[PDB]
Design a protein around this ligand. Sequence first.
Ligand SMILES: CC(=O)N[C@H]1[C@@H](O[C@H]2[C@@H](O)[C@@H](CO)O[C@H](O)[C@@H]2O[C@@H]2O[C@@H](C)[C@@H](O)[C@@H](O)[C@@H]2O)O[C@H](CO)[C@H](O)[C@@H]1O
Ligand SMILES: CC(=O)N[C@H]1[C@@H](O[C@H]2[C@@H](O)[C@@H](CO)O[C@H](O)[C@@H]2O[C@@H]2O[C@@H](C)[C@@H](O)[C@@H](O)[C@@H]2O)O[C@H](CO)[C@H](O)[C@@H]1O
Lengths: 307, 306
Amino acid sequence: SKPFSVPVLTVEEMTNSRFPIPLEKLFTGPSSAFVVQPQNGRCTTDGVLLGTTQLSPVNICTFRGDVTHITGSRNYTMNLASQNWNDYDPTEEIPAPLGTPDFVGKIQGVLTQTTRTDGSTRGHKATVYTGSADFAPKLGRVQFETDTDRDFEANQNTKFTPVGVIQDGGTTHRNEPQQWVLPSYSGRNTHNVHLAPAVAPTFPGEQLLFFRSTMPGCSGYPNMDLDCLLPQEWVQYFYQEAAPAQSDVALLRFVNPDTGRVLFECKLHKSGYVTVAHTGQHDLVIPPNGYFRFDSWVNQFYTLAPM
Amino acid sequence: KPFSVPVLTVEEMTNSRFPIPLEKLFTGPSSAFVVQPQNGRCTTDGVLLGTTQLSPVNICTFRGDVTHITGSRNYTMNLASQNWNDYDPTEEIPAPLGTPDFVGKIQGVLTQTTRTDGSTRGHKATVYTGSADFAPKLGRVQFETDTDRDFEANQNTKFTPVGVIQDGGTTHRNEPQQWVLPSYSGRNTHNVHLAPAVAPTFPGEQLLFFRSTMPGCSGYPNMDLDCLLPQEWVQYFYQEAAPAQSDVALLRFVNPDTGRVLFECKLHKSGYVTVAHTGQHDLVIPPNGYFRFDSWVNQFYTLAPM
Ligand SMILES: CC(=O)N[C@H]1[C@@H](O[C@H]2[C@@H](O)[C@@H](CO)O[C@H](O)[C@@H]2O[C@@H]2O[C@@H](C)[C@@H](O)[C@@H](O)[C@@H]2O)O[C@H](CO)[C@H](O)[C@@H]1O
Ligand SMILES: CC(=O)N[C@H]1[C@@H](O[C@H]2[C@@H](O)[C@@H](CO)O[C@H](O)[C@@H]2O[C@@H]2O[C@@H](C)[C@@H](O)[C@@H](O)[C@@H]2O)O[C@H](CO)[C@H](O)[C@@H]1O
C-alpha cells in the first residue's frame, strides 16, 4: 500500500486553508475553553475532504452567482452558483457551498460583474456579514452591503473576491471577527448540518498546533488572527496521494535541512489535525527552511517529547 | 523517481499568472508575437523560472510601506519580500516573485495596519504596470487610490489584486495586453534573467494554453488570461523533482468515464505544452477529463491531430 508522506514545503511557502493568504507562522495554545470546529482546511490523511473544504486556494471565501438589488438600500442578495457557475444544490450533504467562510465576522472585498452581451464590466466595494440573519449560503443566498444602489445588473455573472476583515471601532477592540464561532449557514433560527467534527487534544500535556496567518484589516480594530488545522497544500497533497493510514496517528518531525536536526516532533491525527506537547500560548520560533517530515505510524500510547 | 502529472481536472486547477481558477483549454497560432510569460514557469524536473513562486495567492500581490505623492491620490510603495523582509534588487530574477507579467491596469485593494494600536484601513487602488514608475525590480511601484490622506508612512501595507480595467472611451478589449511584458526597472531599462520565449518547433503544432477569464472592474477589458502551466503543475513538479529522460513528455488527455483518449499533447521539459492543430480553437472536454503521462519521446514524435 502507498506510503504516507507530507509535502516538503516551509511554513512560509504554504497557504492558509481558511482564507486566501499565505501562512506566516506556527502557534500552539490551549483550546479547552472554546470549540474548535473549522469547516475549511478539513481533510483526512488519506485524502477525504471534509466540511466545506475544496482544493482551490483562491476560491476560499469567494462567492459566485447573480445579484438582485434590495430596493431602498445599497444592499444586494446573491443567488449562489457553484464555483464553476453550475447550479448550486442545497440538498447536497455538506454544511454549505464549498469554500464558504467558516467564521462569524465582517469580510470586506470587491463585487465584480461582467455584462455578457458587450463585455462591459464593473466593480464595487462590498462587505458580507457572516453573522447576519440573511447570511444563508446553505440555502443559496447571501446578502452584500455595497457602495451602489444601481450599478449592478440582474442575470449577469457576479463574483465576490475577499480581501480582509473589519471591526466597528466604536466598540471594544479585536472583539470581531470570531474565528472559532461558526456561522448559521441557513440563516437565523437554523441548525447547521453535516459538519466536520470539533477537535481537541486528548493526551495529557498536548495542545493543538495551529498554522497561523494574519488577515488583512480594512477598517477599525479587527482581530486578524486566523488559525487553520492543515495548510491548504496538505489538503491538496493528501487528496492526490490518498495514502492509507496504518494507525490513527502519524508521527512527524519538524526538521532543519541546514543542520539535519529535529527541532520538535508532533502528531498528525488521521482525521486531519496536529498536536504537540506544550502548555500555554506560544509562537514557535523556527528556521526559515524548516519543514515537516513523516517518520512513522504510532499507536495510541506514544508520548511526544516536549516541544 | 518516475515522472508524472497531477490527477486534477482543468476546473480543479488554478491559473499561474493571476489568482483565479482555470476555466478551459485553448490553442491558437502564436508565431506573429512573443509568448514569454514570467509567472507559471517551471521545468518538468522542478526548476523555477522567471518570477515564478509556489503559492497561487501571492500572484500579483505587493507588500511594503507607502509614501504619499503630494498633490495627488497616488502612493509609492517601497517593496518588501512576501514575509516583510528586505527586498533585494540584486537577486538574479527579473522582478520580485509574483510580480505581474503583463502590461495593464490591475485594480484591487490597498490595506494597511498601524503597528502600535492595530487600527486598519483599506482603499480602492490601481497599478498601471506599463507606467514609467512601475519599477518593481528596483523595489518601487505606484498605486492610484481614492484617498489623499488616510495611509500612514512606515506601516505594513498590502495590495490584494481583484481584476483588470479598461478605458471605455477607446477601442474595446485593447487592454490589458497579456503577452507584453512590463519593463520591470521602469522606463528606458532592459529586463534581466527572463524565462525564455516559447514556440512550437514541430510542423503543424501550436501551444496549448490553460485559460482563465480575469474579473473586470470597469470599462471593456480583454479578460483572457493564458498560462503555460497550471499553478498546481508548478507546485507538483517542484515537489516531485523527477529527472527528465528526454526533452519531451507525451501526455494523453483521458476521459475516466470511458477510458478513451480525447487528445494527446507534448509537455516540453522546459515547461510548456504543444498540440497538433492549426487555427484558433476552444477545446471541448468532458468536465472530469485529466492529463496522464504515458512516456518520454524523442525529438521526432508526431502527435495525432486534435
Ligand atoms: C466609507 C468611508 O468614507 N470611510 C472613511 C472613514 O472610515 C472610518 C469610518 O468608517 C468610521 C466609522 O465608525 O470608522 C473608522 O474610523 C473608519 O476609519 C478606518 O478605521 C480607522 C480605525 C482607521 O484605521 C482609518 O485609517 C480607517 O480608514 O474615515 C476614514 C478616515 O477617518 C477614511 O477616510 C475612510 O475612507
Ligand atoms: C470611478 C467611479 O466612481 N465609477 C463610477 C463610474 O464609472 C464609470 C466611469 O469611470 C467611466 C469613465 O469614462 O468609465 C466607465 O463608464 C465606468 O463605469 C464602469 O464601466 C462601464 C463600462 C459600465 O460597465 C459601468 O457599469 C461600470 O461602473 O460611473 C458608473 C456609472 O456608469 C458607476 O457609478 C461607477 O461606480
